[PDB]
Each structure stands twice: as structure tokens, then as C-alpha cells.
Design a protein around this ligand. Structure first.
Ligand SMILES: C[NH+](C)c1cc(NC(=O)CNC(C)(C)C)c(O)c2c1C[C@H]1C[C@H]3[C@H]([NH+](C)C)C(O)=C(C(N)=O)C(=O)[C@@]3(O)C(O)=C1C2=O
Ligand SMILES: [Mg+2]
Ligand SMILES: [Mg+2]
Ligand SMILES: [Mg+2]
Ligand SMILES: [Mg+2]
Ligand SMILES: [Mg+2]
Ligand SMILES: [Mg+2]
Ligand SMILES: [Mg+2]
Ligand SMILES: [Mg+2]
Ligand SMILES: [Mg+2]
Ligand SMILES: [Mg+2]
Ligand SMILES: [Mg+2]
Ligand SMILES: [Mg+2]
Ligand SMILES: [Mg+2]
Ligand SMILES: [Mg+2]
Ligand SMILES: [Mg+2]
Ligand SMILES: [Mg+2]
Ligand SMILES: [Mg+2]
Ligand SMILES: [Mg+2]
Ligand SMILES: [Mg+2]
Ligand SMILES: [Mg+2]
Ligand SMILES: [Mg+2]
Ligand SMILES: [Mg+2]
Ligand SMILES: [Mg+2]
Ligand SMILES: [Mg+2]
Ligand SMILES: [Mg+2]
Ligand SMILES: [Mg+2]
Ligand SMILES: [Mg+2]
Ligand SMILES: [Mg+2]
Ligand SMILES: [Zn+2]
Lengths: 206, 60, 157
RNA sequence: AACGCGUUAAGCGCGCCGCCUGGGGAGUACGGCCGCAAGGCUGAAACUCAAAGGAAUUGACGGGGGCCCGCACAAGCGGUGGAGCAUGUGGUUUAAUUCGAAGCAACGCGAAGAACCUUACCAGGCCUUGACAUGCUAGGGAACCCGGGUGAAAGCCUGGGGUGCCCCGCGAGGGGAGCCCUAGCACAGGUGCUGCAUGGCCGUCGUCAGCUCGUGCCGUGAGGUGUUGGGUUAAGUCCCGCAACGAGCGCAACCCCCGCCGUUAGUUGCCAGCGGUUCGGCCGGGCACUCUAACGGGACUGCCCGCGAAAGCGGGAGGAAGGAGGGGACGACGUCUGGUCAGCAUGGCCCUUACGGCCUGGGCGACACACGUGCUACAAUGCCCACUACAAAGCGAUGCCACCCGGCAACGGGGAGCUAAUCGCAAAAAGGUGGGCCCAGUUCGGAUUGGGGUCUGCAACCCGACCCCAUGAAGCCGGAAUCGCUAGUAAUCGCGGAUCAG
């Protein structure tokens, strides 16, 4: 356990915070506590929609929950039917002005946490450990990314001896700040236990 | 976090002295910042996702 | 467009400070059963990356074969290492009698019938290009009286 | 086989000789033969093992060498080990003194705040769909809110106030959702175990210059080459050479801090000139400079002599900065089955009227000892009482508390300002001026005690901090051993923040 999280490095250097407000000492404590309910319910449900990055910008007791997600019509339903069910179930938890939008994950391979998920799924899915990770990466320099890398990391394939694996390609340079890379932590669950997964993608130097 | 022991600190107590905080996110009251309602493990873990606004990574 | 069997794979060891490290190696054939046939030997970090690579070397390492009614033109023997390879034509109906590895290479190269033995050392890889060479060296009732005699050829024929 | 052989063949063939036929037993036994003898020659088996071997490759290792670097040793400063106290820890003790950490890389470490709380521990009084989730069925109940009794508290027995919402209806009133109770069932919950079944995150060799792949080249191959040699570098940094050519993760740069300066800016900061001045940047006026944050500029071996194929190197000119200017974040493929199921996450074994739950009290602080970390000392380059200057950083409207009064004082009472460049913590301290002490167990030192008070808090006996008085212990600079630091560093002196009523 030697290295550092890539996102938490470029905190306003080549990335950005999800929750982007202000707050006082009185408010920040409670105000944030809220976001971690907003992002606990929102997640727990939206899973099989492929949810990515969850913005929560804030004005005077106006919450502004944007949502990037693989599949905008499993957030929606038919017509506008199921998005409403939630848009209030949040104002049910806040007690205020939930503006819960939707924004499609255009290219899905070119956004890490998704990439992480489908793999962690594929491991839950009892697939070919290696090939999962190979094709994982495969598609990433197939959609057109600068760099790719996936790190399967459990008791792998059902083995009693805990190991780890991976592969990659292209530029992976996390010591260049000015290189934008997205981290994806997933976390499969299989009969033998729990097998966290990682995925890093380079898009470009700026 | 013994589940019921988040609750012995949630509700208000017999006398006001017993008012010890805890983590909303995990229920370890051992090292908690009454500004995040969070501990040190959490605060990083989260800050490392940029999920706490304005929380930068420091250097001088 | 080349059909391609596979002969043998292995994991081999390097070493280092703290635990071993490895590499894998893949013996591969090729061959349009009417005439031609290659071999490769491929090493690479993860297995089928090698098996794929071994297929490469075989495409360049090709050997056209004198073939004659699905069989071998004369008799033949060759050494290479201490592994001693034998071939010998069989008649219509006797067919790829040969252990493990000539079969793989003879078949895909296109032999119906053949006789065969392996000798002393039996390590695949030697008997592999044991026979890649045994076959580089087959010679034909015409390739031949126009190696010799052919001093003054086309007065003879 | 490879090593190597290589017209001195281990190359290509002819003749003849002797010799081998798996390791151990074994060069033994039996027999013959030879010698004076010591012994030799010839030379087995029973039984037992899946080997015994041969060259060769990558490593690891050497009390083998060659060449580099780190406060690794030396050259220098200051300490520990000794003393008393503070904090962890080992061992004992305990009803329990809950847990885990284990050579450097466990030991002021999980604890960035154990009086109950925290709290997993122990002794008692207890709760059983349970402090918590989404529910199912039978029966009653709106939710809910007030009081008594018993009690160490919990807990239990019990008095009363209350009767909203949805649908149907003229109506009494039935149906329904919620929630409530009683009984039963799903199940909840566990800081029960295993870090040697995992996740993740951390430590570490190590900010060391290393770790590798592609295509090709070379070996039958594992594999090598590349990355090596010479020069250079904080470096696999780079220059030159080479059967190599490049790339991926590292080095490095892009990010922040400090150093110079320019652009936008003049409040709550600032005061060089002018006006007034209660002499206080106090007011008019100004934003010059200091500051104040945002963006840019600038350093490149660019210049010169020298050294050198080059990369580089040495000395200098200019410059605020010179060869990366100082500092930070930043930790490569992997190892130690290193760390924790005690933040959380989870396979599995395990209890589920009990390890689960609530409670008051007791405990992690116990003390024949031992280590590990630090504080203050043992004092004259000092101790002490006055007057006197010069800081940066951070916190504070459930708090910071200027002054005023009371008290020797802690502090209490009263009370102005401050969403904080405007008000406050705020006294900076070593330094400075002036004076007292004169080698003393001392005006050094400030333990441990006796008594008196203040504060936080339901509550200071275990078990708190602070005030005043009296007590004035060890220790006159520390055995063997051993630690840190290469410049604004070491030492020495003060301020601050987090945690948190204290
Ligand atoms: C005692 N041995 C047999 C042992 C056993 C286990 N685990 C088991 O037996 C569990 N096996 C099951 C699966 C339950 C059947 C073990 O799990 C271990 C060990 C060894 C220890 C050694 C540890 C040691 N120190 C700290 C006590 C040490 O010096 C090191 C080290 N290399 O520095 C360790 O690795 C050590 O801490 C350690 O990890 C051990 C084990 O893990
Ligand atoms: Mg738990
Ligand atoms: Mg408390
Ligand atoms: Mg031979
Ligand atoms: Mg043999
Ligand atoms: Mg020679
Ligand atoms: Mg034998
Ligand atoms: Mg020394
Ligand atoms: Mg344990
Ligand atoms: Mg207690
Ligand atoms: Mg471990
Ligand atoms: Mg252990
Ligand atoms: Mg272990
Ligand atoms: Mg370095
Ligand atoms: Mg070759
Ligand atoms: Mg080169
Ligand atoms: Mg190397
Ligand atoms: Mg070399
Ligand atoms: Mg390089
Ligand atoms: Mg003004
Ligand atoms: Mg004037
Ligand atoms: Mg760097
Ligand atoms: Mg160890
Ligand atoms: Mg303790
Ligand atoms: Mg007074
Ligand atoms: Mg006061
Ligand atoms: Mg003296
Ligand atoms: Mg140094
Ligand atoms: Mg202090
Ligand atoms: Zn926490």
C-alpha cells in the first residue's frame, strides 16, 4: 500500500469537486451530512442505470442535483413516469428545493467508474477473470482514450490463495499532474467474498 | 459502530455531559472533527473523491 | 488464411530478489495440407499472447514440401541435438503413424501415409525442428536427376 | 548436451585393444592370486532410494575483488542511559485491570482528549421482534402527552388528558393508511474468530535508481541482447560507443510555499508630501510604500577564460536568485503470507430469553520491577523583581471576552466591541535598561506532602485542572552502550491550532 488516489490529487488542478457550494461552520457539518444521504439513496437505486458523477451545486437552500448516467431512460421510465417518483423522494429527505436533472454518459468506456463497474459486475458474473480485464482495457483504446489500465484484486476465480492481476496500455502517467486521469473504484461480491477493482484512464495533457 | 451505540449518542442523554459526537459515515467517535461530523479515515477517504467542497490537498 | 495446430506450451522460470518471475513459451505448427507448413516457437509475458506470437514465426519459417500421393518421396533420417528423427514413406492406407509431434507437423503439412520413430532424447522442441529440417531436405525424382546429371541437362531430357 | 575441440581433433573414414551398462551399499563380503608385513589385484549380491549425475541460465550469497551514494563512519554541536515527574510498554496483580501493536519498519503508536459517557471489560438490577431495518398473521389500540408508586438507576405495576387522516354513508358507525400494544413468526444485532481465506488503506527496503515490453538480433533451449563498457549525473541524467531501435511504469518537469519584480486593487490595512489636530493615522485628503490575494515576468550552462570528441566540469561578469535557489505534495514492477476483521466493507466457523440490549457502580490509572519516549533540573553565559522593546501564523457571535469593581489570586459580578485586516485571545519569550543574589543542596532545583480556596460539571473518593499559604525530595552535568542534525539546519525561546464542558 504505497501510492495515491489520482482524483484526490488534482483537486482543482485538472479535475473538480462534485459537491460545489459554499458553507459556514454551522452549515457545512449538516449541509454535507445531507449530500451523503442524497448520494446514498440516489446510488442504491440508480445502479442498473449506470450512474457516474453526481454534482450537488448549492445556493440559498436550493439544492442542484445533476446526474451523469449511462442509461438516462432507466432514470426516466416511460414518458417522465419514474423520475418524478424520486425528484420528491429527495425533497422528502432534504425538506427543500431538489432540482434533480439528467445527463447521459455519452461515451461509456471513456468514463472510469462505469468501466470499473461492468468489470466488477463481470466478476460477480462468474466470467473469465483475465479476459474480463483485457477486453476491459481493450475497449478503452478502442473508444479512443490516451491510456488504459484495470486492476482486478481479490481471491480471484474462486481461489483460496488471494492474489491480484491486471494489464494496461498507452500513457498511464500519474506523476504528471497535467495529465487528466479518472479513477474507478468498483467492488464485486462473490460467494467467496469481496473483490475491489480499479480502472484508470488517461484522456489528455492540457 | 455497534449499531445501537451510534444510537446511544444520537438521542439526547440523561445529563448534558454525556454529549460525545460520532461519525455519520461509519460510527467511530475516536478521532472526530466537529466540523465534518466525520473522522480522519473518512475525511480523507471522501476528500480523496472531492466530495467535500473546497477541501484541497495541502502543501507549503 | 492458414490452418494452424498447436504442439506444446510451457511455463519457464526466471528469478529475482523476492519470488520468481516468468514467461511462457508456445510451440505452434501451420500448413495447407497440400504442400506447405511452418513452425514457430513463441515466448511472451501472458500465455495466448505467446501462442499468438508463435503463430507469427511460423508464417516466415515456411517449408514447401515435395509431396507425392500424400506421402514422402524417398526414405530419410536426421539428427539435431541427441534427438534422432526417422521418416519413411508409407503406402495408401497406412497413414500418419508417428508419435505426438511428427503427427502434428506431418498432418498439417499434408501427409496421408508415413512411417516414423523418435530417438534417444525426446524433447519436443528438438524433434520439432529435427523434422522441420528432415523436411527441408526431402528431394525429388526430378529435383534430383537435375542436381546430378544436369551438368548437361536437356540433352538428356 | 553445453563447456569447449579445433592439421597437437573432441572434424571426416580404416584396423586392433581395453573399458562402460542407474545412485547408495562398495572398492566391502566370498573365492582364488601376489607380498615378510602393511596390503594389493580380480571383484559380487541381498536390501534400500527415484534418483546419482553433466555441462549451462537468472538470481540470491562470500569472513572475493573492482567502481559510486546516504549525517553510513569520521571532522563538529547537543542529549539519552543516572536523577524526579509525564506518557506508552514488558512483566506481575486483579471480580475485571477490555483489545491490538512486536528487531530497525511495536513502545507520547490505534487514543487529534477514558471521572459516568466514551467502553468492547467486570459485579449487580434487568429487556426478549429486542437501542435498528423492510415486513407477515391473530386480536386491541389514533399518534400522542401529563402524574403517581417502588427504585442505585434502568425496569415494572399504574392514574388521566387525547381520539386527527383516507374511502363509503342521512346516520349511529364499519372498511383503510399510518403508527401503538400484546402473542407468534420472518429476522434484526455481535468491537464472537481467522489479517495465514479477502477488499481497501497504511508501513517498509526507498525518492533507492532502479522494473520491464515490442519488433529485430543471438543460443536446441531456459535465456541473452536492449539496460552492458568509457565519460557524466542527486538519477536508466545525459554525451560516445556498440545488434540493436523505441516505448510503458519510475527520475525529471506541469501544482503549492518561500526569494526579486511588473499588471488589475485601495477596505476593516497603509502614512512619504500638504491641511487641521483632544497628540492617538485621531480627522480632512491620499494610496505613494508596507501589507493585502489573483494573475503573469524571470535562469537557459545564456556570457566570458580554462578543461573536454561530447555530455559535463571549475573559476567569474551581470542578477534578488546560478547551475535543480531553499522547502512541500509526489513512492516504479515487487517483498516481508509485515499491519488491522477494533473505522467501514466481506467468505467462512460461531451466539441469537444471549457474547446480542438497557442500566447505576467498579475498571483500563492497579505496582516487589524493567525497558522504550519526553519534561524540568542539577544553575553564574545564571536565578530572581521591576521598567523596556521586535514576531509570524491560526481560532472566536451556542464563542473571543477589551475595561470596571471585589479578592493577595484562581476567578466571580457588571458590561462595551466582533458574521471577525475592523473587536478579542495577546503577555510574544529569550534580547534591552536598572537593581537584588555571590558557590550555597543554595533566592540552584521544584518533587512529595499538610491546610486553605476558585472553576468545569447531574457528579472530582477512586480519578481532574488551576489559586494562595506552609513542606523544599533526588539530582553539583551522569557506567558499559547509544541518538539527531550538513545552514537559517543544529541547538535555544515564545505563540498557535486541531481534539474537547473540563
Ligand atoms: C506461528 N506461525 C505458525 C504462524 C501461523 C499463522 N497462521 C495460522 O496458523 C493460521 N492457519 C489456519 C488457516 C487458521 C489453519 C500465521 O498467520 C503467522 C505465523 C508466523 C507469524 C510470525 C510473525 C513474527 N512476529 C511479529 C511475531 C514476524 O517476526 C514476522 C516477520 N516476518 O517480521 C511475521 O510475519 C509475523 O508477524 C506473522 O505474520 C506471522 C503469521 O502471520
Ligand atoms: Mg460491524
Ligand atoms: Mg464528551
Ligand atoms: Mg549424439
Ligand atoms: Mg535417453
Ligand atoms: Mg582454439
Ligand atoms: Mg544396483
Ligand atoms: Mg560522531
Ligand atoms: Mg482481535
Ligand atoms: Mg467506565
Ligand atoms: Mg498481511
Ligand atoms: Mg496478529
Ligand atoms: Mg501475519
Ligand atoms: Mg533521487
Ligand atoms: Mg534463435
Ligand atoms: Mg542506446
Ligand atoms: Mg535491469
Ligand atoms: Mg552486456
Ligand atoms: Mg529515461
Ligand atoms: Mg479611508
Ligand atoms: Mg503632518
Ligand atoms: Mg516528481
Ligand atoms: Mg516483523
Ligand atoms: Mg492507555
Ligand atoms: Mg482588584
Ligand atoms: Mg471573569
Ligand atoms: Mg553550583
Ligand atoms: Mg543532508
Ligand atoms: Mg504550545
Ligand atoms: Zn469516521
Amino acid at each position: 500500500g504505497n501510492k495515491i488516489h489520482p482524483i484526490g490529487f488534482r483537486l482543482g488542478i485538472t479535475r473538480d469537486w462534485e459537491s460545489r457550494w459554499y458553507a459556514g461552520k454551522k452549515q457545512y457539518r449538516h449541509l454535507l451530512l445531507e449530500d451523503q444521504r442524497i448520494r446514498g439513496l440516489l446510488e442504491k437505486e440508480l445502479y442498473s442505470a449506470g450512474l457516474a458523477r453526481v454534482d450537488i451545486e448549492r445556493a440559498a437552500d436550493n439544492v442542484a442535483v445533476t446526474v451523469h448516467v449511462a442509461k438516462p431512460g432507466v432514470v426516466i421510465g416511460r414518458g417522465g413516469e419514474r423520475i418524478r417518483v424520486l425528484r420528491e423522494e429527495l425533497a422528502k429527505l432534504t425538506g427543500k428545493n431538489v432540482a434533480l436533472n439528467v445527463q447521459e454518459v455519452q461515451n461509456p468506456n471513456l468514463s472510469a467508474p462505469l468501466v470499473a463497474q461492468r468489470v466488477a459486475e463481470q466478476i460477480e458474473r462468474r466470467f473469465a477473470v483475465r479476459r474480463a480485464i483485457k477486453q476491459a482495457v481493450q475497449r478503452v483504446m478502442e473508444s479512443g482514450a490516451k491510456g488504459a489500465k484495470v486492476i482486478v484484486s481479490g481471491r480471484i476465480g474462486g481461489a483460496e490463495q488471494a492474489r491480484t492481476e491486471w494489464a494496461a496500455q498507452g500513457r498511464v502517467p500519474l506523476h504528471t499532474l497535467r495529465a487528466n486521469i479518472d479513477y474507478g473504484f468498483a467492488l464485486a461480491r462473490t460467494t467467496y467474498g469481496v473483490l475491489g477493482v480499479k480502472a484508470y484512464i488517461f484522456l489528455g495533457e492540457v | 459502530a455497534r449499531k445501537a451505540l451510534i444510537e446511544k449518542a444520537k438521542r439526547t442523554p440523561k445529563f448534558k455531559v454525556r454529549a460525545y459526537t460520532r461519525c455519520v459515515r461509519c460510527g467511530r467517535a475516536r478521532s472526530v472533527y466537529r466540523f465534518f461530523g466525520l473522522c480522519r479515515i473518512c475525511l480523507r477517504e471522501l476528500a480523496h473523491k472531492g466530495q467535500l467542497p473546497g477541501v484541497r490537498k495541502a502543501s507549503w | 488464411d492458414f490452418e494452424e495446430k498447436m504442439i506444446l506450451i510451457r511455463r519457464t522460470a526466471r528469478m529475482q530478489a523476492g519470488g520468481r518471475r516468468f514467461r511462457f513459451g508456445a510451440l505452434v505448427v501451420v500448413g495447407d495440407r497440400q504442400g506447405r507448413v511452418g513452425l514457430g516457437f513463441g515466448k511472451a509475458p501472458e500465455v495466448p499472447l505467446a501462442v499468438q506470437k508463435a503463430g507469427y514465426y511460423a508464417r516466415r519459417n515456411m517449408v514447401e514440401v515435395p509431396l507425392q500421393n500424400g506421402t514422402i518421396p524417398h526414405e530419410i533420417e536426421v539428427e539435431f541435438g541427441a534427438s534422432k528423427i526417422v521418416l519413411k514413406p508409407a503406402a495408401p492406407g497406412t497413414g500418419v503413424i508417428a508419435g505426438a509431434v511428427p503427427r502434428a507437423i506431418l498432418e498439417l503439412a499434408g501427409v496421408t501415409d508415413i512411417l516414423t520413430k523418435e530417438l534417444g532424447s525426446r524433447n519436443p522442441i528438438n524433434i520439432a525442428y529435427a523434422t522441420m529440417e528432415a523436411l527441408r531436405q526431402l528431394r525429388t525424382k526430378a529435383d534430383v536427376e537435375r542436381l546430378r546429371k544436369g551438368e548437361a541437362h536437356a540433352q538428356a531430357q
